[PDB]
Write an enzyme that holds these catalytic residues in place. Structure first.
Site, PDB file in Angstrom:
ATOM      1  N   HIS A   1      13.153 -65.924 -50.701  1.00 27.05           N
ATOM      2  CA  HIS A   1      12.829 -67.288 -50.214  1.00 27.05           C
ATOM      3  C   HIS A   1      13.885 -68.272 -50.757  1.00 27.05           C
ATOM      4  O   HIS A   1      14.177 -69.248 -50.079  1.00 27.05           O
ATOM      5  CB  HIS A   1      11.452 -67.684 -50.701  1.00 27.05           C
ATOM      6  CG  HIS A   1      10.399 -66.678 -50.395  1.00 27.05           C
ATOM      7  ND1 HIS A   1      10.019 -66.396 -49.077  1.00 27.05           N
ATOM      8  CD2 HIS A   1       9.632 -65.902 -51.215  1.00 27.05           C
ATOM      9  CE1 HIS A   1       9.047 -65.503 -49.075  1.00 27.05           C
ATOM     10  NE2 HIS A   1       8.763 -65.194 -50.380  1.00 27.05           N
TER      11      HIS A   1
ATOM     12  N   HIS B   1      15.426 -73.727 -58.914  1.00 25.33           N
ATOM     13  CA  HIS B   1      15.816 -73.204 -57.616  1.00 25.33           C
ATOM     14  C   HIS B   1      16.191 -74.344 -56.713  1.00 25.33           C
ATOM     15  O   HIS B   1      15.967 -75.541 -57.082  1.00 25.33           O
ATOM     16  CB  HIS B   1      14.732 -72.317 -57.000  1.00 25.33           C
ATOM     17  CG  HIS B   1      13.470 -73.089 -56.740  1.00 25.33           C
ATOM     18  ND1 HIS B   1      12.448 -73.241 -57.634  1.00 25.33           N
ATOM     19  CD2 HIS B   1      13.162 -73.770 -55.616  1.00 25.33           C
ATOM     20  CE1 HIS B   1      11.494 -74.059 -57.048  1.00 25.33           C
ATOM     21  NE2 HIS B   1      11.935 -74.447 -55.757  1.00 25.33           N
TER      22      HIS B   1
ATOM     23  N   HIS C   1      16.308 -75.704 -52.368  1.00 19.26           N
ATOM     24  CA  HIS C   1      15.998 -75.555 -50.941  1.00 19.26           C
ATOM     25  C   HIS C   1      17.157 -76.210 -50.193  1.00 19.26           C
ATOM     26  O   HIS C   1      17.691 -77.210 -50.693  1.00 19.26           O
ATOM     27  CB  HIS C   1      14.714 -76.279 -50.551  1.00 19.26           C
ATOM     28  CG  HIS C   1      13.551 -75.848 -51.380  1.00 19.26           C
ATOM     29  ND1 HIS C   1      12.605 -74.908 -50.924  1.00 19.26           N
ATOM     30  CD2 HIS C   1      13.155 -76.231 -52.610  1.00 19.26           C
ATOM     31  CE1 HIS C   1      11.720 -74.713 -51.905  1.00 19.26           C
ATOM     32  NE2 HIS C   1      12.091 -75.483 -52.945  1.00 19.26           N
TER      33      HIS C   1
ATOM     34  N   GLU D   1      13.299 -81.123 -49.070  1.00 17.38           N
ATOM     35  CA  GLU D   1      11.823 -81.024 -48.807  1.00 17.38           C
ATOM     36  C   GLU D   1      11.254 -82.443 -48.809  1.00 17.38           C
ATOM     37  O   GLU D   1      10.743 -82.886 -47.774  1.00 17.38           O
ATOM     38  CB  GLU D   1      11.200 -80.122 -49.872  1.00 17.38           C
ATOM     39  CG  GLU D   1      11.744 -78.728 -49.778  1.00 17.38           C
ATOM     40  CD  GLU D   1      10.741 -77.663 -50.208  1.00 17.38           C
ATOM     41  OE1 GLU D   1      10.325 -77.714 -51.380  1.00 17.38           O
ATOM     42  OE2 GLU D   1      10.316 -76.836 -49.343  1.00 17.38           O
TER      43      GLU D   1
ATOM     44  N   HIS E   1      14.874 -78.096 -57.608  1.00 18.22           N
ATOM     45  CA  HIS E   1      13.569 -78.137 -58.291  1.00 18.22           C
ATOM     46  C   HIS E   1      13.652 -77.502 -59.646  1.00 18.22           C
ATOM     47  O   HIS E   1      13.938 -76.279 -59.715  1.00 18.22           O
ATOM     48  CB  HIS E   1      12.526 -77.411 -57.459  1.00 18.22           C
ATOM     49  CG  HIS E   1      12.244 -78.161 -56.219  1.00 18.22           C
ATOM     50  ND1 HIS E   1      11.603 -77.634 -55.098  1.00 18.22           N
ATOM     51  CD2 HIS E   1      12.429 -79.473 -55.932  1.00 18.22           C
ATOM     52  CE1 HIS E   1      11.404 -78.559 -54.198  1.00 18.22           C
ATOM     53  NE2 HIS E   1      11.971 -79.661 -54.639  1.00 18.22           N
TER      54      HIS E   1
ATOM     55  N   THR F   1       5.502 -76.197 -53.015  1.00 15.40           N
ATOM     56  CA  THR F   1       5.938 -76.363 -51.640  1.00 15.40           C
ATOM     57  C   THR F   1       6.071 -75.010 -50.929  1.00 15.40           C
ATOM     58  O   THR F   1       6.453 -75.015 -49.749  1.00 15.40           O
ATOM     59  CB  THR F   1       7.232 -77.158 -51.536  1.00 15.40           C
ATOM     60  OG1 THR F   1       8.236 -76.284 -52.025  1.00 15.40           O
ATOM     61  CG2 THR F   1       7.092 -78.518 -52.161  1.00 15.40           C
ATOM     62  N   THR F   2       5.729 -73.909 -51.571  1.00 10.93           N
ATOM     63  CA  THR F   2       5.688 -72.572 -50.967  1.00 10.93           C
ATOM     64  C   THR F   2       4.310 -72.034 -51.267  1.00 10.93           C
ATOM     65  O   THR F   2       3.657 -72.416 -52.265  1.00 10.93           O
ATOM     66  CB  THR F   2       6.773 -71.602 -51.492  1.00 10.93           C
ATOM     67  OG1 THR F   2       6.469 -71.293 -52.850  1.00 10.93           O
ATOM     68  CG2 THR F   2       8.165 -72.171 -51.353  1.00 10.93           C
TER      69      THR F   2
HETATM   70  N1  LIG Z   1       9.049 -75.317 -54.575  1.00  9.75           N
HETATM   71  S1  LIG Z   1       8.228 -75.620 -55.840  1.00  9.75           S
HETATM   72  O1  LIG Z   1       9.023 -76.189 -56.875  1.00  9.75           O
HETATM   73  O2  LIG Z   1       7.061 -76.431 -55.473  1.00  9.75           O
HETATM   74  C1  LIG Z   1       7.625 -74.073 -56.448  1.00  9.75           C
HETATM   75  C2  LIG Z   1       7.097 -73.153 -55.567  1.00  9.75           C
HETATM   76  C3  LIG Z   1       6.622 -71.943 -56.043  1.00  9.75           C
HETATM   77  C4  LIG Z   1       6.633 -71.679 -57.408  1.00  9.75           C
HETATM   78  N2  LIG Z   1       6.097 -70.455 -57.882  1.00  9.75           N
HETATM   79  C5  LIG Z   1       6.530 -69.617 -58.833  1.00  9.75           C
HETATM   80  S2  LIG Z   1       8.021 -69.948 -59.568  1.00  9.75           S
HETATM   81  N3  LIG Z   1       5.766 -68.516 -59.071  1.00  9.75           N
HETATM   82  C6  LIG Z   1       4.529 -68.139 -58.345  1.00  9.75           C
HETATM   83  C7  LIG Z   1       3.760 -69.318 -57.812  1.00  9.75           C
HETATM   84  C8  LIG Z   1       2.324 -69.199 -58.291  1.00  9.75           C
HETATM   85  N4  LIG Z   1       2.175 -67.815 -58.712  1.00  9.75           N
HETATM   86  C9  LIG Z   1       0.933 -67.223 -58.708  1.00  9.75           C
HETATM   87  C10 LIG Z   1       0.240 -67.028 -57.514  1.00  9.75           C
HETATM   88  C11 LIG Z   1      -1.128 -66.824 -57.581  1.00  9.75           C
HETATM   89  C12 LIG Z   1      -1.775 -66.788 -58.804  1.00  9.75           C
HETATM   90  C13 LIG Z   1      -0.991 -66.933 -59.938  1.00  9.75           C
HETATM   91  N5  LIG Z   1      -1.643 -66.877 -61.300  1.00  9.75           N
HETATM   92  O3  LIG Z   1      -1.338 -65.951 -62.050  1.00  9.75           O
HETATM   93  O4  LIG Z   1      -2.411 -67.778 -61.621  1.00  9.75           O
HETATM   94  N6  LIG Z   1       0.346 -67.127 -59.899  1.00  9.75           N
HETATM   95  C14 LIG Z   1       3.488 -67.309 -59.165  1.00  9.75           C
HETATM   96  C15 LIG Z   1       7.156 -72.625 -58.283  1.00  9.75           C
HETATM   97  C16 LIG Z   1       7.655 -73.821 -57.806  1.00  9.75           C
HETATM   98 ZN   LIG Z   2      11.037 -75.663 -54.714  1.00 10.30          ZN
END
Ligand SMILES: NS(=O)(=O)c1ccc(NC(=S)N[C@@H]2CCN(c3cccc([N+](=O)[O-])n3)C2)cc1
Ligand SMILES: [Zn+2]
Length: 258
Positions: free
Chosen positions: A62, A92, A94, A104, A117, A196-197
């Site tokens: 992504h 990261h 976008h 975004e 971000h 945002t994902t």
């Molecule tokens: N673009 S942004 O900046 O809004 C941005 C977008 C995505 C992420 N996600 C990252 S780096 N890792 C993923 C997202 C959440 N994740 C999960 C999913 C379900 C449950 C759990 N849990 O253990 O509680 N963890 C691990 C960071 C930032």
């Molecule tokens: Zn992001």
């Protein structure tokens, strides 16, 4: 048939697996600069990156993520709208297929070429996975990129992208200093939003810097040479990995500056 940014699996489809896509505090948003409220009680942002320990760079299919050691208070964000201490876990970007899109957040409906971000989690929750389940779990520092003069502090990232072309590829990436990606001013907008994902969790205090950084045409072209696919799968360039602006709903965007 997993989420992504294509015709068949892109942002208009996400709500079918992630119904919070239609929730009350989704991100990104348009920043209407005229209706943002100056909050003179907002504190200066404190960005403390001098002890940052970068580990690796990953193409996750992504975007690409530069990951840091978040097992101690080495790179932290404090102050501004925040209560307590948030640790940097990764950054990261976008970006677009063309310089006229890729961000975004928008500013008075303007799209920048890209958006950086810097993702931080609230140390009171112990780890990133717990933090994402909390309404105050994350602080994401968002920085717009425009195309003009190079950003010298970005070039180490651009030069390693040849080694992580495809989904799942990682490379060692130590001694990268994220202070080299910051603009001069730390004036900001702030609002409560989401990732945002997918999974689109409503756990983010967004901090969007007013001042964009300038990157070169050659720097953003190198981002566009990346792939969404794995090695040996059909080649699909990693471009236009941005979610469009979502409704603000019952939110006010605050400004640290008049
Ligand atoms: N673009 S942004 O900046 O809004 C941005 C977008 C995505 C992420 N996600 C990252 S780096 N890792 C993923 C997202 C959440 N994740 C999960 C999913 C379900 C449950 C759990 N849990 O253990 O509680 N963890 C691990 C960071 C930032
Ligand atoms: Zn992001």
């Amino acid at each position: 048939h997993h989420w992504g940014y294509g015709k068949h699996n892109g942002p208009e489809h996400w709500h079918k697996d992630f119904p919070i896509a239609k929730g009350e505090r989704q991100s990104p948003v348009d920043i209407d600069t005229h209706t943002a409220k100056y909050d003179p009680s907002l504190k200066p942002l404190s960005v403390s990156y001098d002890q940052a320990t970068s580990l690796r760079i990953l193409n996750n299919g992504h975007a690409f993520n530069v990951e840091f050691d978040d097992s101690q208070d080495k790179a932290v964000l404090k102050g501004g709208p925040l209560d307590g201490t948030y640790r940097l876990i990764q950054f990261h970007f976008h970006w677009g297929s063309l310089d006229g899109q890729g961000s975004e957040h928008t500013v008075d409906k303007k799209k920048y070429a890209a958006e950086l971000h810097l993702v931080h989690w609230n140390t009171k929750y112990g780890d990133f996975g717990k933090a994402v389940q909390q309404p105050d779990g994350l602080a994401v520092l968002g920085i717009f990129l425009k195309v003009g003069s190079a950003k010298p502090g970005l070039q180490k990232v651009v030069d390693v992208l040849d080694s992580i072309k495809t989904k799942g590829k990682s490379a060692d990436f130590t001694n990268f200093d994220p202070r080299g990606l910051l603009p001069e001013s730390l004036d900001y907008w702030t609002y409560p939003g989401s990732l945002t994902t997918p999974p689109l969790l409503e756990c983010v205090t967004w901090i969007v810097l007013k001042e964009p950084i300038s990157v070169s045409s050659e720097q953003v072209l190198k981002f566009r040479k990346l792939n969404f696919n794995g090695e040996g799968e059909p080649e699909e360039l990693m471009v236009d990995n941005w979610r469009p602006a979502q409704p603000l709903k019952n939110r006010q965007i605050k400004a640290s500056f008049k």
